[PDB]
Design a protein around this nucleic acid. Sequence first.
RNA 1: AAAAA
RNA 2: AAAAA
Lengths: 463, 463
Amino acid sequence: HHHSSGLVPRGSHMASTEIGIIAVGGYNEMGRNMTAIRVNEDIIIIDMGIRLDRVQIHEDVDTDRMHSLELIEMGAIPDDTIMNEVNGNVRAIVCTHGHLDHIGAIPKLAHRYAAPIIATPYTTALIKHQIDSERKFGVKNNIVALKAGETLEITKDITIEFINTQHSIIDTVFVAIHTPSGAVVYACDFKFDRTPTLGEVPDFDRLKELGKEGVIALITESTNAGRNGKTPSELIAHMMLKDVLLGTEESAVGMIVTTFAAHIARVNSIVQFAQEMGRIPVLLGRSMERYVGTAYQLGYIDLPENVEIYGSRRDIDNALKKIMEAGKDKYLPVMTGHQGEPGAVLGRIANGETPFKVETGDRIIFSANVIPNPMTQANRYALETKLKMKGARIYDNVHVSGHAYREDHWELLRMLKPEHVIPAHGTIQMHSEYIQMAEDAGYSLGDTLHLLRNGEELYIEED
Amino acid sequence: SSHHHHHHSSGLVPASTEIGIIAVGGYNEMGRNMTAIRVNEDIIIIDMGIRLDRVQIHEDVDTDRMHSLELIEMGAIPDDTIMNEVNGNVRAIVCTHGHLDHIGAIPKLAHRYAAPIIATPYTTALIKHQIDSERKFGVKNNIVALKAGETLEITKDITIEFINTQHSIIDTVFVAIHTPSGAVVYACDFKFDRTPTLGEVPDFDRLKELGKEGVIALITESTNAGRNGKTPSELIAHMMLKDVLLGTEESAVGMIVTTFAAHIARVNSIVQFAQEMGRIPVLLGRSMERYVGTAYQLGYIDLPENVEIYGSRRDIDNALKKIMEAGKDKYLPVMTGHQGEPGAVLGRIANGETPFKVETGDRIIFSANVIPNPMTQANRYALETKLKMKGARIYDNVHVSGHAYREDHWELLRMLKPEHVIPAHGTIQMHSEYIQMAEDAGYSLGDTLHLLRNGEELYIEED
RNA sequence: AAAAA
RNA sequence: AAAAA
Ligand SMILES: [Zn+2]
Ligand SMILES: [Zn+2]
Ligand SMILES: [Zn+2]
Ligand SMILES: [Zn+2]
């Protein structure tokens, strides 16, 4: 009547954790990143960014005085009102780096959470500056500096670990939230770079050990998941810049470099090259003086003794007049304005509102890409047009991406071996690219690979 | 009553040279380059290329057997029948380098001119191979090797001077034709590179002295005159390739590199990297063995003693079987097939016609761009699809251009200071980009800057 | 921006 | 793929 047809060994389940991955902002769009990681009933928020182009389509603005509510309806900033419906209390706000798509909403949203803001030293300095420029909401949460390679226990069941990575701004980290059932890893804005010009190589060994210890969930950017291969090193940008600036038969001509003021590795390269060209490096622009000065005070870069740095309009204009009457061949201005922003140094030069006059053959070196949004493309087209009309020669995109490409994501998947993967930090189209890559690596959509929309919570019941 | 005055010029002179610039091929399209430079009644032909896509649009076509005329009506090769209306006699055929768009039509056209063929040593070697493959015309012309930095007297009134430059094939030169009335310079297929990984830096000093001695006319490629800035050095390709091959946590995986067989610098870099990865470099493909072997026999590259090189199908399949049964982690195959050409090694691997089996995670590295014509895009799309369907990971465009960008052209104008400029080697769209640059430099179209079409002769007289 | 065999 | 002042 009866036969044996199987024996199955059952596993043990000594710890049970409920994990929630809540997509708040930056999952339907570029910008305004914010994620919530719930461990049972405690929550770690990671990043609170701004989406700058939603500010740029309205012309009055000034975000420093607008209320959270109106910025959420412009969106602009993440709609964190969904957090009233998430079953837990926030115990920390973590920011992975200092770009505005990760910290820009801090002075608008952070003050409603009874939680410290935790970041790397440079990032905490920039968060403090952002909060001091705010004055409709009174913000200062506790701000805690945590370095790459260190841990901080938030709850007896939750610890936060910073893992060094590389990116287009210094002191970027992966975040590992350790729970009784394993680690949730957040890897948004990162780049593998084995020859960084500043900082250290990403901590591949520790990525491997976390992979073997157990990752419940990887949250990672999909921004360049559709670019084939691997991201070129920042060393490539450094060498291209060096050859643009030094490899020329026209060395006595006027030259201006413009780049992201927060790209401290790029600025560092430019300043060193200035020494090699026998020119005096002159950093111009409030943002240049703030970001680079801050990096210098924290020991992140050294600066030559002859560097000059001006952030105020009168010293900027004075410095430009000095440059003009001493000979542009004697200086290397490094200035704000690479996206044609209004008020920035290079835009004021291009409008003729400055003692510096561009002349035929002067070289303007954009050590940056054009942000692919129509607003910034218009500003940059107007700026470039004005400079070309005065005879400038344009060297564009002397630059490499700050983001991981498809094969970098492949290797990060192979090292962290997460049980579940969640693309973040992009449009649904970018997540589509990431999804195809993750399925070539063995993941299945809706099972171990998850596509979230803003406002959606993924529940993971881990045994 | 009324009155004015005027000084009548003297008729006295205080020999007259007529220059003809004849566009034969490559002025309306990419490929099939050919220019004739007439000095009164002597003519120097420069280049006789083939245009390969006009061959690829016809199925089962053996150009080695076709007559000149039918290839001209395919166009394909330059229509030199216009030379029956040019009032001069050809005294020399110069080739600036060994790419097929400069030498491919030599065995179809050169034999009707009572003239030597003059080129650099590597280029004469490749021209001899091109003539040995020809099965329709018996060719015939004396072949003369002239090195960069040397001069050769062609006529009592005409000498030819080779000036060293850089390009994606070794031994490329600018050509300066000296006439009683000054120099006509031909710079088609050049790149400024101050850190080449093979050969010497372009001879900038001699370009400057040529500018001051007097250049009547510059004929120069417009290929990338629309790319802003300056061409990245070949060292950039060398470092990106090095980081793709060495900068990885998955080093025991299968890796294949494919690149242009004639790009001896790239091949050299790859072979050295193989030594550094502890893998054995194995070059595969008839073209690879011919181009690389020729470079080695002439002392243009050294090769490690553990190199293996197979050009015949039997030795290639045997080598791939050895690779498979010894472990793909022990070899770095460097092979033909980067444009998905049929019959090339990587296409045969991708079709499963080979003992080598692509497996999940194997890395296929294209150290090359996809040629932008629909035929080649179709081949490369079919190849890439087949490789991806077997689990391959594709690293594409690990590569920098072989051609001057807009600002390289700017500086070359600044150094040669030609009285007249003629874009060549491209479509009218590329010449359009070049024209905008040359007018920023002071030239005027139809006066000192000239847009020519295939079949047209430009007359330049002494004032 | 050039082939491949 | 990020601002500027
Ligand atoms: Zn970022
Ligand atoms: Zn970001
Ligand atoms: Zn060429
Ligand atoms: Zn060419």
